[PDB]
Symmetry: C3
Subunit: 295 residues, 3 copies
């Protein structure tokens, strides 16, 4: 796209604020930003806020979201679809034109780990170019295992294809498949979907801890066979809904857009890989590391 | 196939009749019928009754099916495999020769949303050419959420490949991936697997209704990441068995041949897309629409 | 690999012995062995013990495994990752050099049907070349349906690609997808992953029996839509954990590395195919047979 030649819009922080006991404002941008998805490989991503996947959103069950999208793309319209919400797609997930803003309001009444993404036709194009992310909705009554958890992180799986190539997007294998982590608390890492950052700077934990991961596979196209090497998942909640409780899974099948809360114990010091067990995808990037130490 | 050149057998209605409290007769044809799977693209499908997917069958839990297949194909043998039934495959799902009939009898003792398909070697060939469908077996004690449901529809996902090309069938990506709807009650739509009909003539519903969909992904080859835009599934029963109950799923993973009953609320007027969230497949056709109005 | 030219190491039996109430020794080899994966097609597989998938391991919940790997490969290092165990991957699943042994110790505290495989970088390469298998961990309190089961078998699904071709492994479709069976009791078959053996020598059962299958899809890359023709699964335990109980599934979705215990009734004499319902994979080999007789 001629109007994207040379464009590299600096990342803008997510803006969020509570405005009532059950109402939150969120303000994001749609923007065009160069991301290093593999060593030496820059993708001029279509993004929310200059991150791909986008910034993490966390709300409470029962919160109504008042969402603003500021479209900084000079020529392409963009939109937002939160899977967490009940909305009219043809009124509430509609396009915001270049250089304009739009505000939409809708309730998040279901707990879980939900995908969000741009909803602009062709959706495949907007997702594959980078406009995806996760919104967590915290359950009003928690999870039955909350008292057991020592540490938590968010991981997101996505694919990258040949740049803005709709033939490849529809008909080709992924060039890269990657994990990213999004911060839940100060000091947590916050990364983009790339083949290396979570290998080089592993997530951290202590020996004997029970770890919770909030996970979502945003696709666009692949399913995920989520596995942590050297452990077994003690508890799994499908889509992060507390009622969808499985125990003792070695690997969690995630559809495209599929989420879960998973919990596991790291019993020994060492480095623990985190993979999709579809090993072709792992080989093309989708391995993160968790470094477990005595401190 | 030389004997299929020029053949376009008119669709024949499904014949069904109850013959006892726990016995039903079903009579289908195997026939060769031109179907428009994409605008301008005719596929000379191998079908049951000149529909692809085939006609919907609905029986009650505990019904014995007395099934007749009349084979109208001039040269290819065909057969029937109902996933709902307990049968001897090598006695009961056997071939009926061109211009002959065969009758087979077997019980449907398990509730759910089951695939049926031709079982003639090579099965991939017969399925991919169009000989697939769904049989619903209604649970004797219903579903715990039955009283909540306002409206219901059936949707089926399938793929189409290069015409009768076994190399493509085994080794290629789908050319199209599509939804169809099959009628449960008078006035419901009844369509074939195509890229456009359920976009142009959406399914209908009223604001505030809880909708049930009976869904099956017949493949032949792909898995499905079933999602309704603008809502969350309140209840999901895997394979339509009432015991396999999940809550608050954003997306349901269906294997090839996999079924579910899913229920969700449409809270606002508008058009709600229904997709497989494997967006490559969506882009190649698998988007249906549900139009929700104040009346 | 020049040092593998002409090498065909005879299969070595698995060595296992109990050494305490909650401790077992297991001794395996890594070795290079010619396997006939399709009629006329030899693959010079990287194996455990000259079988691909590897020998079946069965332990009890709560057993600590003292595992020895003797590496008979003249030039490639190998390792072992059991999904059943809690271990430090970077201390316990490490490489054993050619012509050396290594001993590692770790607990199996979770019941189920777990994948094991070589963990040597690039893992995709080691898995795809044949270094995969299953370890069953028997639950201390059994399965609620144990008293109903008449007969049991183990089946494993895997893929084969172009020989030792990492481009194909990462980016290509499988050449073959196959089932194998591993012996649980004397007299059971014990086979390798090939396109024909379980068609030509079906598994055996008697009319009216409830059959249990312990199943795992080791990949490396594909998911599995596991189905037995002519029946419905009465009970399914995901990953073989007794808590993950589904009922009346026609087809079980398995991730790559995914396992299950499944149970079904064969009501009539005949031959019952067992497939992945991803029919492209079935066509490329993944059909086994169960022959059900009056005796
Ligand atoms: Cu309040
Ligand atoms: Cu507001
Ligand atoms: Cu966009
Ligand atoms: Cu979506
Ligand atoms: Cu792919
Ligand atoms: Cu702890
Ligand atoms: Cu664990
Ligand atoms: Cu009766
Ligand atoms: Cu009759
Ligand atoms: Cu047929
Ligand atoms: Cu079938
Ligand atoms: Cu495909
Ligand atoms: Cu209502
Ligand atoms: Cu909803
Ligand atoms: Cu003891
Ligand atoms: Cu020992
Ligand atoms: Cu190895
Ligand atoms: Cu593994
Ligand atoms: Cu493939
Ligand atoms: Cu019995
Ligand atoms: Cu059955």
């Amino acid at each position: 796209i001629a109007a994207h030649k040379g464009v590299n819009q600096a990342p803008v922080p997510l803006k969020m604020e509570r405005v009532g006991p059950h109402d939150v404002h969120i303000e994001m941008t749609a923007q065009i930003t160069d991301i290093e998805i593999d060593k030496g490989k820059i993708y001029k991503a279509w993004t929310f806020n200059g991150q791909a996947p986008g910034p993490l959103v966390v709300v409470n069950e029962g919160d109504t979201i008042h969402f603003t999208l500021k479209n900084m793309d000079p020529v392409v319209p963009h939109s937002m679809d939160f899977h967490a919400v009940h909305a009219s797609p043809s009124k509430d997930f509609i396009d915001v034109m270049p250089n304009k803003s739009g505000t939409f309001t809708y309730p998040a009444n279901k707990p879980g780990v939900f995908m969000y993404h741009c909803g602009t036709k062709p959706v495949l194009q907007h997702i594959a170019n980078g406009m995806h992310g996760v919104i967590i909705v915290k359950p009003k009554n928690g999870y039955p295992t909350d008292k057991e958890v020592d540490r938590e992180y968010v991981l997101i799986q996505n694919e990258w294809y040949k740049y803005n190539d709709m033939n490849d997007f529809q008909n080709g294998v992924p060039s890269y498949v990657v994990f990213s982590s999004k911060a839940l608390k100060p000091g947590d890492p916050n990364t983009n979907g790339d083949t290396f950052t979570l290998k080089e700077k592993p997530l951290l934990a202590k020996v004997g801890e029970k770890i919770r991961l909030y996970i979502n596979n945003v696709g666009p196209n692949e399913v995920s066979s989520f596995h942590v090497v050297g452990t077994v998942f003690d508890d799994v909640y499908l889509d992060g809904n507390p009622n969808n409780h499985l125990q003792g899974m070695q690997t969690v099948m995630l559809p495209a857009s599929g989420g879960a809360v998973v919990e596991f114990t790291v019993t020994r010091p060492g480095t623990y890989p985190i993979v999709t067990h579809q090993f072709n995808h792992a080989q093309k990037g989708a391995v993160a590391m968790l470094k477990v130490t005595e401190t």
